């Protein structure tokens, strides 16, 4: 019901948010599959050939059986030392994206919450217009029928208040498609809410926008990750640049070998070579292989290496000139907010001064129905704007700790202390 | 002209959907090409080397001349299986994204379709609306020769007549632009088409939302896609705990192989094994290997796949909600626009008889040129939003098929029941 | 400051464009390595080997050491030529995907600074608004106290410049929010531009429909990539229909390799065979391979890659009818934004007009203040109408150099000859 209550429920549930959890998971085991070619690797082989010779070897058949433990083992490897680094530093990268995506959620959420408070506050007072005008229409419908104001006004007065009724379908639908949007978000439909509490609020200035730029170079998510993204293709540099160098490996094998001969060209001037031996064997080798070269492969892919580290650090300065426009209009847009509550606030009271001006005109001759059905809108609409500010200028809090790579749970209680009564999201 | 004609002319030719074709094409025949490995394969090797032995050597040379058919079988290998398997799960979840963008041009086609039909509305109305004003221009320049209105009151109308002129103009590039938008999901320019039978338009209450729903878990084809993708990543489990398994094949071959011996140290003290060999060989061999340890490769390739299927079970519990949320928004939506087509026909009522109120008034001096052109405007705002109205029920009815599944040829042809008469894309 | 020097400081800085430069220059590069495998390929082996024999050859021990230069050389490899066109077409479609880029920054350059431009008019107007509206209250005040107005005139007047004021912080908020928009793609922050000059303004009419139709499907960027891909998908059939071919290679070594004998079984009834040898050898062979049968692997790859071919073949349909869209859209747009200012510019004129005849009727009693700031309103919208529809025009005249391909900094020199004073981004 309030919104810590929402995210809670939220924070448990969400698809989007577990896949990343999964992805980044995924992306930590895979450490593991990256260190194992540098662990001993031991496989068992074991045939059964049977050989037919011909044609200046016709006569002489075999059929052999052999069985062996292999043994591999890196000694020198730079390029498997590299795969697990490179992996390594994926891992991390993975890990910021999952923060990120934590991030998400929060932001998300609260946007999601305040979105179906303010379509709650479009809908009621979309209906305070409603009843105002209905008493408008009914009190000229009772001066008609006495003979004090004419047929006119009447008709004007309806015309007016079925627009008002036209809508109030719309503000309900957006209110229940908000709903809906929450319901996606959070997995629960909220029969209420916490209201934002109107006579507590207050705002207060912003940060200075270099302080807050400052922050941002520090703490912010997406550049963390654009710096960690360049970290990997310098890295990826040095993978290339190890196909120049040599490798040092290990082999280890025990195999059995059996072979009989048979036929016709078997014994008889072959002597003791087509007999029956079963051999055995126990071997340690090492194997050592320096390139030289291989058609400029090498060094052509340590070039694109070098090009695609160029590419990672424009990104750099792309999600640095993303993250100033970022800070830059959040910090804009909280002091319009602001702003605008204060214009909003003078202007309900100057709206309901000027419709009080035109009832009192109306019923000397200066001012018409018409004036009055008007001057009951701009003060409904007046109304509706002060309250939209204030929504706007609480998003605004939220997109800019989410800028500066802080937004967090804190954040929200801070949020949650502002709200109290309930609320229906489903009146009538 | 008409929708059915528009969405048959659409289907043989949009390339959206005939590279999806492709799509599903392409992953249907790379079945094939997964079952190859578990069949015959046959090669023809053949060699010439040429040696020179040096060094305790010295004086030995060859040149052999060898030429083979090899065959490899599998007879047993679990991985060869599963690769088969997962392109078949791999070209069933390309068949139902085919059913799916099937469905899109159905939805896009009739959604381009009326949305032409609703620009042509918003400037039919506009140009009605010029006119009504215009008539209005024209009579105040008529009364205000022969000394019955003020210069006020025709000054007050061309100002506002200019307004409408521009207004015009941009209802015009609307639908020169939808138009367009037609012409690119449907390869034609149409010059006309048929427009909605507004003399027979009723609406109808939606099936209750939790049978629309109970229906959509059964058969959206986004989340039948979902789901297949979460089998997909229950064999990819089964895929890489293979890799323990043992593999048994077969080889076979018949090869031949010259070799003469040439220089000074082949004769004398020699014996026999530096003659001229004439091989001749036909082998059918057994080939056996099982794992046994690869650094815990498998294992953590395993526990990758494990998470990755977390994720998928993930992604399925993202289809629902996102599509909980297309059909109660829909639901909700298809009853927000009946109440709105009830809503601006009354409106479109009061807004006549208001207007009629306003001409009153002016001729005895309770109401301005300027109420009665505002009036003017009302009563054209509200046939507007009605004739707007009536499309987004249309549009909604779509939207609530595509979600359930079944948007298909026979729900495209009650629509065209709902069309007569034809209509202009350029008028003037 | 203009516009020509906006753009020139975005070309040397801009991260998104150096990025695809970088994408460019590393596919060009990789020709490098996709000739590679058609030259010498030149390897150095060198191990040492220990075996231990048992049972049946127990008491027979060697350790051997061998040491070789080895050569890998093409002669005949269609598939090794292929990879070579296949990246040399490869880097051909990057270096179109630069020339769309190189294109994008000139057109999201002006676009931006133009943007600039509105919201500085929009503001200035909005200012403008705001004191006609303030010079109406104060006279009205006045006139309150000498007795000549009634108190419902300066209650009328202040609710109205309330909202006016509302409006301010909206107009100033998206002007410091475009300047962001600017500085994004630019890099600098801009205190000031050169203003579009509205003395010196005139329109043209575009070239025909068709002319324009016909150059660009000679020169746009977008399809010329379309059909380099589809290219790109034939030589890929071919790519396929390769593996049916037979390979013709090329080996060379030389090589030395010790092998001392030990232990029990060494002498004696051996006879030469376990002594020492120190072997030397120089090899030069040719390989030769041809498939006959895969298991269909072959030939379902090829039918794969034809299906593929449709697929691209399609995607270049697509791209034909979403260039023809961006044409003839764009054509729509420029006309309809030349109607525009002719119906704007007649609008100021009936407006200004109008608001003298309420100002007029106000004063004689047939008008209200209400009316006289209604005037005032609807004067001021059309003038930031007009001024909105001159730079709606100039980005249309963007929007379709781009989309005929020609788009550059000669057609950004004519915009910049449209300049003319300077302007402030943030003005009081």
Redesign the interface.
């Known amino acids: 019901e309030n919104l810590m209550q929402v995210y809670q429920q939220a924070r448990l549930s969400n698809?989007?948010l577990?896949?990343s959890a999964?992805?980044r998971?995924?992306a930590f085991?895979?450490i593991?599959?990256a260190?194992?070619?540098?662990?001993?690797?031991?496989?068992?082989?074991?045939?059964?050939?049977?050989?037919?010779?011909?044609?200046?070897?016709?006569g002489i058949n075999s059929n052999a059986t052999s069985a062996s433990l292999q043994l591999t083992q890196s000694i020198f490897d730079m390029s498997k030392w590299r795969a697990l680094t490179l992996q390594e530093k994926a891992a991390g990268i993975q890990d910021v994206t999952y923060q990120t995506d934590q991030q998400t959620l929060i932001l998300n959420t609260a946007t999601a919450y305040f979105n179906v408070l303010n379509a709650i506050d479009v809908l009621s007072y979309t209906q305070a217009q409603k009843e105002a005008i209905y008493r408008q229409l009914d009190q000229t419908t009772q001066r008609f029928n006495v003979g004090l104001v004419?047929?006119?006004d009447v008709?004007?007065a309806?015309?007016?208040?079925?627009?008002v009724?036209?809508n109030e379908?719309?503000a309900?639908?957006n209110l229940?498609?908000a709903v809906?949007?929450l319901?996606?978000i959070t997995?629960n439909y909220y029969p209420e809410l916490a209201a934002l509490n109107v006579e507590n609020f207050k705002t207060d200035k912003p940060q200075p926008v270099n302080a807050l730029l400052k922050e941002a170079e520090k703490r912010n998510l997406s550049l963390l990750q654009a710096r960690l993204s360049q970290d990997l293709a310098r890295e990826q540099i040095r993978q290339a640049q190890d196909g120049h160098l040599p490798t040092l490996d290990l082999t280890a094998s025990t195999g059995?070998s059996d072979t009989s001969y048979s036929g016709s060209k078997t014994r008889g001037a072959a002597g003791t070579q087509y007999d029956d031996?079963?051999?055995?064997?126990?071997?340690?080798?090492?194997?050592?292989?320096?390139?030289?070269?291989?058609?400029?492969?090498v060094?052509?892919?340590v070039?694109?290496a070098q090009?695609?580290f160029?590419?990672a650090s424009?990104?750099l300065?792309?999600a640095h000139?993303?993250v100033?426009?970022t800070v830059?209009?959040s910090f804009?847009?909280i002091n319009?907010s602001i702003?605008?509550i204060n214009?909003?606030k003078?202007?309900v009271v100057?709206?309901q001064?000027?419709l009080?001006?035109?009832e009192?005109?109306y019923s000397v001759g200066?001012?018409?129905i018409?004036?009055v059905l008007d001057?009951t809108t701009?003060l409904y609409n007046?109304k509706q704007?002060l309250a939209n500010a204030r929504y706007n200028y609480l998003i605004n809090q939220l997109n800019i700790k989410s800028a500066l790579g802080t937004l967090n749970e804190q954040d929200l209680l801070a949020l949650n202390n502002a709200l109290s009564k309930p609320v229906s999201t489903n009146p009538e």
């Open positions: 698809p989007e577990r896949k999964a992805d998971d995924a085991e895979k593991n599959e260190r194992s070619p540098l662990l001993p690797q031991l496989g068992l082989g074991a045939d059964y050939t049977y050989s037919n010779g011909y044609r200046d070897a016709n004419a047929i006119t008709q004007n309806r015309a007016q208040y079925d627009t009724l036209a379908l719309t309900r639908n229940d498609n809906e949007q319901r996606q997995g059995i031996s079963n051999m055995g064997q126990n071997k340690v080798g090492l194997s050592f292989s320096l390139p030289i070269y291989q058609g400029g492969m060094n052509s892919q070039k694109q090009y695609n160029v590419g424009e990104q300065e792309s000139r993303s100033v426009q830059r209009s804009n847009n319009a702003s605008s214009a909003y003078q202007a100057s709206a001064s000027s009080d001006a035109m009192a005109g200066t001012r018409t018409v004036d001057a701009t007046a704007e």
